[PDB]
């Protein structure tokens, strides 16, 4: 949100964006779709409904992005129910959408019919880390040594006169 | 004496049984092995505390090696039960055995395999390896170039 | 084997000295205690690994081989010193 | 005594394993880390610096 | 019938199967120990080439 | 140890520049100082690829 | 008994001079000097020498010709004006060792104590260190072979004491000293990898050729231990040493925050300067 920059200009812009943009992560489908046209009076004048309406079936995919930034197996009561999502089929079904993003790391396994997943995010501490920051060395030995430059050639452009 | 001595391959006792025995036995030589059994106790506290000993020296021995002899596999072959293993251990971290690696999982134990710092001691590895390779690539080098002129 | 898996197993060893499983600990103790070989294994399930030992006789493959790994050697170094070199030199000088 | 730090471990309830480990190099990050916050003031004063001698 | 002779793989007991899946060796460090020394080589450039 | 002792100097040196501007008293630099460090850190550079010389041959 | 030895440049100057003296007469053998120094610490260190009238025969090696009075009066005289300093060995200047070496070291194996050899070159050509001391001493061969005195190189450097230094760095003006940072680091990491590169290329080649057309005892046996300690680096796989590319990358990494930052304060005086001085004797100069 707006968190380091305090200006009641950005904040009379959010105004009306608040509820909406609190509404994104607890992403609860039958209520704020109803909020969103409810008092959508310029955002939704703004032009077109686009993102919005790309929003609108966004709500489960960044909510079962929070079931992945959750735990590993998917019930068919709890966490289906909890997606207000009741079905063995659509729940692996748009869960494998989320798979073939590529944006997450799961285990498809079906043994008994429950799906796992390992659910890994460890990241690259101790995990191949030289080839890893390797090019964050590079580029930004490049970002700091391009700023070398751009303190030599400037006082280039001072003692250029005298 | 040189069975103790060193690089003491794990040897039967029982091997060890007869030689005290005729150690009692004959009176040419060596008679008071009967007054190391002179009291009722004491030549008992010597014999345990020298199958003690000596079956500790062993794997202080063994100890040097990084050979992984994996005690549960050792205690097979001692014919010791692994209780007075863990007794030995009693004698081990008496004995500062406090350098190893024991295991919840299995029962075979690693005397070695640090934390292996490489700022340390895959420096010191890398130090003496490389450098002893330059230094002893370098004499026999020149000494054997020295050895082709005599050929002319 | 000079690389590629210095690596190995007992089931060689006692292949090749028809000798049990139980007494390949008492033979590679005795190898280690003539000293000869300095190799010690860190296995848990049981493998062979070594180290320094003394050819000490001849081996013709390894005069070849020797020759082809060494030839190797001196012309990586060369081609690392001749590709280092080539732009350092030009940069730096 | 973990929680108070006399010495190095971490405990299990299901596996019931204790592992110990220890951080020797504790003096680099203090010093680069304290040298990037004392720097701060250094850029942010020199764009109060430049902030007063432009606009 | 058609993916057998699209994706040529391996069909098994009543099973799909699934091979090739991060089964990757990792990198012998050497080559980018070389383009790390040429990272080396351009830092000595970089940093003075001028001078 | 001797950068950070210094920026604990150079700390305090921006109100200076911040209030006088005119004339220098200080004949203690401090930057050429730092290059020689940084000359002496770029060691570690230097023979990283050094390192990277010999693990590859 | 020794481990190393020092050798001063004023000897090898006096090869120089070995070489000034010549008198252009079409000979330019391994004119033997004899070698001052001092035996008297574990060390050997070389202070300075002399030169002997020596001559050799065209066809036999065996003939060789040296002086004992020569040798008794110059180191007389020198010991009459120095005798902080004794005899010790001798040198020749060629590069290569002939079969009546042994008979030359042994005259002063004999008259002098046990005297060291030296190895230097008659056109400083190589990029390798000219002198190797080779020690003059009879060792037991495992072969069986009957025993024979034999040069074992002892490792040396050069060294100047005081004033050698002064007057030598005097002469050149053309070398840099130690000079720690960018350039005497990195000349050495230019040459560096040709200078081993020479070494083993100059080696194995002819020695490769001794392998296939050599007989004749050429050290067969330091052959096992060669090619052993050769083979005991096997291409590590590097997967322990991992972690230790991620200790020296992360002490870059330190560098990386040092130099970026560092330079970033030096950017300071430079962009402050820039804007106030110009734009006040600017504003100034109407």
Sequence with gaps: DRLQFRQPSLKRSLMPYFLLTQAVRTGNLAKFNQVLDQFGEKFQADGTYTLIIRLRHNVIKTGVRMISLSYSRISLADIAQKLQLDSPEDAEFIVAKAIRDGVIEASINHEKGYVQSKEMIDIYSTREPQLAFHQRISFCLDIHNMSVKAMRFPPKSYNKDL | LLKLFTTMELMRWSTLVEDYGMELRKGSLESPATDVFGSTEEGEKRWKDLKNRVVEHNIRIMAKYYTRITMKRMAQLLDLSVDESEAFLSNLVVNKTIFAKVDRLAGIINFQRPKDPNNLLNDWSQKLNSLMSLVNKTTHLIAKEEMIHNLQ | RPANHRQLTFEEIAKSAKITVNEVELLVMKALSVGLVKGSIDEVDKRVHMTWVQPRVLDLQQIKGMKDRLEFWCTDVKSMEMLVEHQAHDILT | ?55 | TDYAKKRGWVLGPNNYYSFASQQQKPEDTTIPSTELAKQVIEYARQLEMIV | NYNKAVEEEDKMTPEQLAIKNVGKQDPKRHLEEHVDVLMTSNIVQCLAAMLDTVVFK | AVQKVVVHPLVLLSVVDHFNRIGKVGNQKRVVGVLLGSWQKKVLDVSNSFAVPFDEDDKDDSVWFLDHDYLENMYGMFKKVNARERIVGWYHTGPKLHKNDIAINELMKRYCPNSVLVIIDVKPKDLGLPTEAYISVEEVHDDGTPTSKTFEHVTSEIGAEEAEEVGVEHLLRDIKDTTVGTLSQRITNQVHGLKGLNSKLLDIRSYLEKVATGKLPINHQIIYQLQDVFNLLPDVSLQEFVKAFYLKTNDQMVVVYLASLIRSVVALHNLINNKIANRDAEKKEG
Excluded at chain 4, 20 to 36: G, H, R, S, W
Excluded at chain 4, 40 to 48: C, Q
């Design chain 4, 1 to 55: 005594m973990i929680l108070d730090k006399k010495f190095h471990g971490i405990l299990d309830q299901g596996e019931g394993v204790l592992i110990i480990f220890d951080e020797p190099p504790v003096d680099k990050t203090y010093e680069a880390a304290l040298e990037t916050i004392q720097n701060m003031s250094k850029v942010v004063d020199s764009l109060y610096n430049k902030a007063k001698k432009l606009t």
